[PDB]
Symmetry: D2
Subunit: 138 residues, 4 copies
């Protein structure tokens, strides 16, 4: 399995982009194992909605990308293309709060991959949001 | 009902922000009626994933925000807070392609609002993605 | 290809199954064409939860099966296997109420099919529920 | 408060209803505590689609009802009304197979409750389906 430094470099390369992935530049990788990736982020103004809490679209981007990372850490190593994503929002995350983003692969099929993602407050473990992501690998 | 110019100014004010809503700065409002908002956007590099197609997180942000706009255009005028969002991805949108984002309110309840959003290719009407968004108004 | 009368025959044979599809025996097919099927049902005690309203599980079964019928009414004729289903519940349907279930295919791809389903109160057109169903054809 | 034996009694009374809940008559309750209920069922012909596997509608009913039981097992004791349900289907469950249905409440709010549900093959622990259910308590 890969060293944390390797995964961090891969992630940093992904985020150092003119594309939309740039919005994840503040995200840090804490751990990576086959089918499981844990990231951390401090919620800053750039990540927030009008009310100054973590934007639903930022949460969605996190779910999308961190689950993709976990799906990729597999025998096949294919990222796949998004088919379905759902997110349920349960607690607000305010500016300054540290969040954990935990993505777990539920199944790697012949053509489909499925993953779940929890966003939690790092300090007290409070559940911010949970998402599920289905991707087509072919 | 409000003039298009008024809605455009409100939207522009929303997007001219240090917050995450900044990612929608290229979006133009085409029409607004109670419970229904149509926006347009040209897909540029900043909106894309690694493959150079519209990023799933950008689509999610569009669904979130355009549905919020339609929910707000109501007797109550409350934006609400996200509870559940789902997106199904059906066709890729490439760089240079013009997209329509159409949000329709399905129901305004006493405490909950529900809206659907279609993303389509403006030129041929091809369905890019469809999302549904449930918000808590209280 | 299928015809309305052939789809009607299925809802007699699919519904007098010993299998779970038996729960749809009271459903009448009103209309069918490639990619779209419309059914009607009167809500009866057998369809209800303990609160006297249409059971969420019955709604899910309706979404599942009627979308499957619309997907199968195609040149390929594949019914597919379920991948993702989501349902948003907006208005209760009470005993005695006549409901319309309307399934429209959004895309038939090489390996995936996508359909939306509306359940409406027949008498006033109000939305009871809306579902989306993604199926794997490969 | 509820107890396991009381939840068991409900699955005898809820299940010998003339209503839709009758479809869960073969379900056995193994475990219950505030916010979590675990059930077991052997897949039988009555639970299947025309392909001899666990019907998606039966799965949805299981997700709906067992999550409702977990939500009701709380200090408030509100069963709630369904708002959103989503299910991802990952592995077929065949006739004769014993399945576990595990519902865990994620959050009980002032007006909303959120629960996740796993269906697993009892013999190997493989994930059949995973659902999320949001209910309104107000």
């Amino acid at each position: 399995s890969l060293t944390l430094n390797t995964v961090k470099q891969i992630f940093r390369a992904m985020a150092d982009s003119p594309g939309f992935d740039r919005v994840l530049s503040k995200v840090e990788v804490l751990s990576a194992a086959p089918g499981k990736v844990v990231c951390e982020m401090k919620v800053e103004e750039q990540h927030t909605n009008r009310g100054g809490t973590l934007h639903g679209g930022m949460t969605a981007t996190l779910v999308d990308m961190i689950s993709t990372m976990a799906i990729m850490y597999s025998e096949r190593g294919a990222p796949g293309v998004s088919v379905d994503m759902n997110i349920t929002y349960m607690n607000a995350a305010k500016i300054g709060e540290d969040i954990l983003i935990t993505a777990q692969v539920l199944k790697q099929g012949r053509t489909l991959a499925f993953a779940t993602v929890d966003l939690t407050n790092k300090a007290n473990g409070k559940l911010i949001a949970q998402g599920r992501h289905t991707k087509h690998l072919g």
